[PDB]
Design a protein around this ligand. Sequence first.
Ligand code: HEM
Ligand code: HEM
Ligand code: HEM
Ligand code: HEM
Ligand SMILES: [Mg+2]
Ligand SMILES: [Mg+2]
Ligand SMILES: [O]
Ligand SMILES: [O]
Ligand SMILES: [O]
Ligand SMILES: [O]
Ligand SMILES: [O]
Ligand SMILES: [O]
Lengths: 306, 306, 306, 305, 306, 305
Amino acid sequence: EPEPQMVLSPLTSAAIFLVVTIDSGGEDTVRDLLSDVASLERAVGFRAQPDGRLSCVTGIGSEAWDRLFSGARPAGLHPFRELDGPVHRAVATPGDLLFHIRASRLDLCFALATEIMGRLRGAVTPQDEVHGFKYFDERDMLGFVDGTENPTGAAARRAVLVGAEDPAFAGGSYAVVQKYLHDIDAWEGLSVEAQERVIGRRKMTDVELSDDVKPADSHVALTSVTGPDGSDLEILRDNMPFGSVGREEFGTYFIGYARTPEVTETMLERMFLGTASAPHDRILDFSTAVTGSLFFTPAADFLEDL
Amino acid sequence: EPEPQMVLSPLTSAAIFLVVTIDSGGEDTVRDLLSDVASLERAVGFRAQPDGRLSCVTGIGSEAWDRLFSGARPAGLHPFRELDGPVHRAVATPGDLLFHIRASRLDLCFALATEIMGRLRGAVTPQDEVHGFKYFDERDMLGFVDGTENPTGAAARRAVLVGAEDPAFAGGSYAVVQKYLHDIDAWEGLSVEAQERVIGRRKMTDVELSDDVKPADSHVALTSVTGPDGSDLEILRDNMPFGSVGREEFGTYFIGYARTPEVTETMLERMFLGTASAPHDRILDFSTAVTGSLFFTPAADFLEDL
Amino acid sequence: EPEPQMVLSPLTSAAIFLVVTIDSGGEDTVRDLLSDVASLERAVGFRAQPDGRLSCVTGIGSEAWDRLFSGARPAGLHPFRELDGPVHRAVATPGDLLFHIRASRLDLCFALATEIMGRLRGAVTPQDEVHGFKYFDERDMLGFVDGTENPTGAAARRAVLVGAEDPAFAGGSYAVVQKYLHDIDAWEGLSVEAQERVIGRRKMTDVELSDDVKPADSHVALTSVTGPDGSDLEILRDNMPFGSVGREEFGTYFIGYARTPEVTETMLERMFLGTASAPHDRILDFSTAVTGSLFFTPAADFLEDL
Amino acid sequence: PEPQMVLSPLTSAAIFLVVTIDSGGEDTVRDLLSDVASLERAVGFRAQPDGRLSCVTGIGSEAWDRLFSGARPAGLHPFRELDGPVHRAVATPGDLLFHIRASRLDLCFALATEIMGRLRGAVTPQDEVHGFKYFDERDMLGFVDGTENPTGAAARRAVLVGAEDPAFAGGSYAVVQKYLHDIDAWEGLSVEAQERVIGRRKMTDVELSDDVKPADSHVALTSVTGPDGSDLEILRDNMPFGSVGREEFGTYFIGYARTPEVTETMLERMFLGTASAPHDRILDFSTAVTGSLFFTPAADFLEDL
Amino acid sequence: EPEPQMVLSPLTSAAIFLVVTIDSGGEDTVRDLLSDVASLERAVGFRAQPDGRLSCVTGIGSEAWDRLFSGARPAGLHPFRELDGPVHRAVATPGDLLFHIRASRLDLCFALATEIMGRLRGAVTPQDEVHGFKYFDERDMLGFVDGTENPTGAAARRAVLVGAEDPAFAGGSYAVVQKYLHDIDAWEGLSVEAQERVIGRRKMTDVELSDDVKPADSHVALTSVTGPDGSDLEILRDNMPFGSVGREEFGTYFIGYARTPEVTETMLERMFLGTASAPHDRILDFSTAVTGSLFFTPAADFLEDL
Amino acid sequence: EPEPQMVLSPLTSAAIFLVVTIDSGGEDTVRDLLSDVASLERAVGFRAQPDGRLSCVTGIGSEAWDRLFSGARPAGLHPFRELDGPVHRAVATPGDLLFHIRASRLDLCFALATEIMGRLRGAVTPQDEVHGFKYFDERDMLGFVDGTENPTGAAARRAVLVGAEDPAFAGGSYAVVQKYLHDIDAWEGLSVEAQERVIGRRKMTDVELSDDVKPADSHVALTSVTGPDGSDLEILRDNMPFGSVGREEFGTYFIGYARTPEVTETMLERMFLGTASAPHDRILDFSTAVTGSLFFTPAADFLED
Ligand code: HEM
Ligand code: HEM
Ligand code: HEM
Ligand code: HEM
Ligand SMILES: [Mg+2]
Ligand SMILES: [Mg+2]
Ligand SMILES: [O]
Ligand SMILES: [O]
Ligand SMILES: [O]
Ligand SMILES: [O]
Ligand SMILES: [O]
Ligand SMILES: [O]
């Protein structure tokens, strides 16, 4: 069976997200680093075992893939698609490589990010760096519990990992990232009951609103999608708050993994373009996307052997 | 005793340092916030007891003191004094208020910073915001253990808290802050033995170099000061690493507390201006100060009663 | 393919056992709740991950099964069989649903019980509610370590989960519950050596008595059974102390899971009715059963699909 | 004089045990009082330092006069019933209180077992509640409970008898009330309406500002200043308890103070109201079913019996 | 106040006891080490804060004192006194320096012992080295909880620290050490009830036997001493199991601290020589002392100032 | 289907290594103990769950195998082979049984060792007993992080457990032990950069030296082996510091598990006898082997019958 990267991580309370572009002439430096990234993860993480829980998931974009590798492409790999909705826009922003670094402490994240970027100096240009922290009750910046309905165990493996449908790339996954900034002043002007109608769950107790009260333009309603067979199509999310109080930046860094980007893209279309029953996802009236990128995260074997 | 602020905190692995200036006309809003800052610390922190260990130490600058308060001044309060050394310079930068927020996790720090700045919107201008994290074995960004010779218990209390020498302000302290950025490329070009000669301690085991090998221009040699009495003059430090990998910013946020600023200032003069046997502290050949401010941190009761 | 409930839970230090009967006309309300119980476990539990270790195992009795479902019954499902021994009696008491709620803290158990019962009030009548706690170093109220010879890993899965012998119900299990009250005054009148002879293991060190000295009417001797094939027949137990000091109630809540009730029932026959060499299990001279019920705990997907 | 462990660290489990002393049980009770600290160490030591087991023992007014002779604590009297226009604070029997706290219920239970084992035949149980911390220091109404308790020296000064009653210095006065909540009614309010009842924000536990906090909120009525301008404070360690099958959801209130006058003033304001408030709105969702007052002596008083 | 050494340590589960004699000419090397031992404790321990709980208490014997220092002697310092009882003997063995090193883990103790002995190589001869480990429920090698009636807080300070009675040495203490080996086969041949009679407390529950049933020759009876003043005379103990299974060595390392050796010496006389009602402490019928030494542990400032 | 011993343990910070020989006539006592050793592991360890992490791996040597059992032998079981290198020597020393006892605390290790040896008194002679302790940041006595490149998960199972190649013994493993003593004075005389050249990794950050700067006689270079197919051959190690400051003994107790001893033996030959590019492993210039033994650790089911 092929060994995936640590897409299915334990719960972690710190993350660094690093998105870079590859400069002209930097391909070979990048390739050497890809073949060492797992050993750097162990070097930095081992001595903090077992509670460190350091992992790094490395992703490669569509245009970058063609620069770095020849042969087969993953079937679902394409550039992030801009969505120009009637009201809200999901922008596409440049990104060749993603490093999704997670641990139980920010310092381990930082130490590994330092080693990675030290090897890439002069070959890449940083496009985004976010230092994320979880709130202590798994809450996000809007004050709701964030992650509750993620799949677990076998159902998670089936939702996130490429299998026999693209056998050369089995054990990989597709990651979509978007950095969101929130209008907290507007959000805090809503009553709790109104906020619950935006999200689709109760705020304090995290119980889902019943089908007869949950609005069609709530976040939970629009991101619930069923496949041909009547079964739910699922993604795995690990959204992280971030911010700066002096600049009034209060953010959610969205990351979602799926076996095929189509699932994630369907959810995004429903959110931003709307449906017959819903103009758009009401969460977007308090949340603005400022980045958007899609990456393929190969199996760990693929990175080692190259 | 009067009740001090939580200057002598347990070890905490996260901090936010927030420095602001008070805008014209902002004084009343600031005074209201000062009288409520202890209750905001409890509101954010109590529910995370006992692990959260959230505390906020609030400091007031010399010029701000004059704008905010009627009567007598703490004896040692003055603006930070610039040191113009033959090679290195300690700059003075603006700062009216300091919020030194510490906890076992960054989210609690952020939540308290958000509430404080929410109340001060419109009355203050942010000057500096640093999100600090401790490395896992109390190391700083230069790879050395940082904190080892801090005083503890009664010796700490005696070194840090104003007493009978200034009885109206008993239970306060004086905080000096400087944000330092490091030249990591240069530092990593030294051998370990050369780095040990700069600091004055062994890198891996943190054992002090013996008196016959410790250079006169090492950091430990220059920041060891004896008073008239033959006794050691001590400060309490809680230096925090910070940075950004993409911008190549690797930093130490220095903060030192003492019962009189003279102790801290003597150490700084020795570092920047040197002595008979040392041109300057060798740590400054790898460290540039980009801020410098001095604050008085009053007793908790002083702030409550406004 | 089939996902069991969390029968094989990590060690947890708190539990709630809830046994109810279904009132006339309550079947529809019960069926709606069964399809949502996994959702409620996530809503309460997710925000306390990963330490909370909250789970709910839901079991259905023989008579209730026929009221709720039509089509196939699990092969082994029948009402608990009363054992009328010459001295000791194992009573059968009413029970249609079992909720076996476990966590590392009681509040999570209570919160989930509250949500379940909130949905069912008006449809069910409570018959028993016990709040269990871990007592020292995995000890029970008799002062002996309790759980030592439980199977683990693969052997646990094979002992507890229905497989190919009843393929429509694969991934389920059978739970037997009995609430026992102890005569502590009588028990504490025995010497430690005499107590060890009752149980069959050493009290302080939990070392099993050798074959030469272990009495045939000890608890360990009577609950050790080999099948026709020479191999040990095993169950999985998660007995919990409970009590009330003012009422002088000191109890053990017995729960045992097995892939077929015949294993558990054989152990019970040996305990209450005896063998050629042993009149009854000596533990029963200090322990009285006041409830007795048998439940089938279906695979998690069986409940989801209602 | 060494106080009992009235000022405990935060603990997540408690047992509250209230008993009456049967006719003729006085001598058995006195022997147990002189050993209770030894039993606390015997049960607790092996779980140190995380166990944080402690037992505070209190004695009621009528019981005091049966057990001891000579001078009595200045403020010791039976709990005073409050018969308000709407709400009533009842007085219920109780001679001895054992307030047992730890980081785990088993330690509490083990110590309660040893204490009651020694008292068998001399006392009759009146109340037994097994309390648990609920999430992030929340109570059964879903609000953080404990936030404005005093700490450190301010706590010592609010709770321990001193020079005002020198023979009993180092003691304290405990008031207990068991409350049951009408959760269905409470959950019918919006969050904003619940915040108006309590006087703080629900999710963030920030106090409402003085211009929106109602005069009949819980925080408004239990804030009291003395003649000299300073806050009169008590130390509380309220614990949730309940039973899901009986629909019983409760708060076990316990408040310590250096004189019962402080606690009693707060209770009068809650139950009988003020010029601007008919009663504490929390009582529209909360019914007291017990009420007792105890003196908790200095530890050396108990040792020397 | 003077600063005492860490005689009153938190509970620690590992220890190293080192006893050495000072060779001919070794005094200067020893004096240098004594003035640095507090800084070695910080160097090894600080980076393992807060869990490490590393400390070192350094003690000096009667003969050694006169070689190392001139001026005043502590009033109670003398060589350990052999007690030649009718049956049992408390032996005296050589020792000039004691290092009592404690932590939550053996490796930290070892690291500090390595640095100390590294500095003393060539100046001292090792006499004893014991690596001690506590059992997980504070039990000793005999299976009883060990530590229960130690004083705590103010009562401990008053029992252990020299004060105004010898003001030049205020903040010091006196340590007695004895290494005991046990006859485990004999001990394990007793019933639990018989063992309880030897100790004076219940084995499982650690409740003291009542005055009416506790034998006069039990350990607890003989080590309970009242002074002329009516009050209990107390010491602070931190006994540690040690051993080697291959050599059949199972031991208790006794260490007891007191403000004057007379308290400890009185207890030893009662144990070894007996009383009117007791021939000797019954624990000695299962325990043989093979070392015996007495040390003065000075205040920390005394050592720093050399 | 066959249940291995706890060869793949979580990280543990304490260990006891116990090596014994079986005396003449002691075979029956040993066989009885082997059938009970897993139940002793549970008796001592269950009550210390979940933090205790106590396990015992039991190994049997080649000559002992023939005394205890007849029928099939594991295919790879033979006595440890002495290596007489031009400079350094790997000695073979006697040992019939190995008990590799691990936990989060030394007391649990000792408690289990006591029970095991209690049952074997009179039947065995101890040859070695080592009480190991890991440093807090997974460092060894040389100050380097130790364990970093061990395999994990499925790669560990595939490297360590006997499978279809020897189906009667599937689920077993082969353990090689060597006790090393270090010359710490010589080691501490090297600069950090020189130490890094001996090991092959950076000391502070544990990052491997790049291929173009890593010396051919570094420890990491010589213990990296590829098989016929070009894939890496791996072992699982759990090296433990030990020592005595008074006797100036500072040691590493090496234990390596592998599905066949050939892998471990190839690494040893490279270390002691060298290659075309390297006279020997530079770590041996600071480390002397004073024991050497090889054991088969059967599947747990094999011992239970
Ligand atoms: C500002 C950005 C976002 C915030 C603050 C946010 C927050 C939340 C919250 C609070 C929940 C409910 C609890 C749970 O995690 O199950 C949730 C659910 C969900 N969100 Fe988001 N979300 C964001 C963006 C997105 C995006 C961009 C997508 C998809 C492309 C997405 C997909 C989901 C899905 C699939 C669920 C689960 C729904 C279900 O099956 O119940 N989220 N989100
Ligand atoms: C770039 C900024 C700095 C870095 C990275 C740094 C780092 C260190 C390190 C590694 C030590 C040795 C371990 C310890 O005792 O903490 C130390 C000690 C010390 N530093 Fe700094 N330091 C900085 C700035 C300062 C400044 C600006 C002051 C004074 C104004 C200062 C005062 C001290 C003192 C008093 C000590 C302890 C000396 C003693 O052993 O008695 N440091 N520092
Ligand atoms: C008063 C109620 C009970 C108490 C206090 C109790 C207590 C114990 C104790 C102390 C042990 C020894 C350690 C271990 O758990 O392995 C044990 C073992 C066991 N008990 Fe119970 N038990 C009770 C009722 C029952 C019942 C009703 C059954 C089965 C119907 C049962 C089945 C077992 C089994 C199978 C074992 C393990 C035997 C073996 O060593 O293989 N127990 N029990
Ligand atoms: C003499 C004492 C020994 C010490 C102190 C020691 C120490 C180390 C250290 C520090 C490392 C690097 C970090 C790691 O991956 O664990 C290492 C790696 C390793 N050691 Fe040892 N070692 C010793 C003996 C041995 C022996 C005897 C063998 C084999 C027969 C061996 C096999 C290995 C292997 C295979 C690696 C992994 C190399 C790789 O692929 O990176 N070691 N050892
Ligand atoms: Mg009903
Ligand atoms: Mg109701
Ligand atoms: O999400
Ligand atoms: O510093
Ligand atoms: O059991
Ligand atoms: O309260
Ligand atoms: O002792
Ligand atoms: O190794």
